[PDB]
């Protein structure tokens, strides 16, 4: 009936919506991984700046 096609329509709506939901989940997840790697290289930069600054100060 009209209820049947309405149900199938909201069904495929839910399907595409959850699909895009998991999709942006994955996308923002990759972005968070990239940002974590950024933080890690950032702490590497902090440590290297600290050691070279300390060497400069020692001399």
């Amino acid at each position: 009936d009209f209820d049947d096609i309405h149900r199938k329509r909201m069904e495929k709506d839910l399907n595409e919506l959850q699909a895009l939901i998991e999709a942006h989940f994955e996308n923002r997840k990759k972005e968070e991984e990239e940002l974590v790697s950024l933080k890690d290289r950032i702490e590497r930069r902090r440590a290297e700046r600290a050691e070279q600054q300390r060497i400069r100060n020692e001399r």
């Binding site: 909201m10 069904e11 709506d13 919506l17 959850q18 895009l20 939901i21 998991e22």
Partner: protein
């Protein structure tokens, strides 16, 4: 978030449809039982009329 809202909306569409069907079925039961009991009363009056005719 995003998918969670849509899933909630689906769960709500099921809610509305099930509740509406339940209410409609309850109204149908009320109407049908009223029909049956009125028919039974008509049958009783016919029995009494038959009794008077027999007398």
């Amino acid at each position: 978030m995003d998918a969670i809202k849509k899933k909630m909306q689906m769960l709500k569409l099921d809610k509305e449809n099930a509740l509406d069907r339940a209410e409609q079925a309850e109204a149908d039961k009320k109407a049908a039982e009223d029909r049956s009991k009125q028919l039974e009363d008509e049958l009783v009056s016919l029995q009494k009329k038959l009794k008077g005719t027999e007398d």
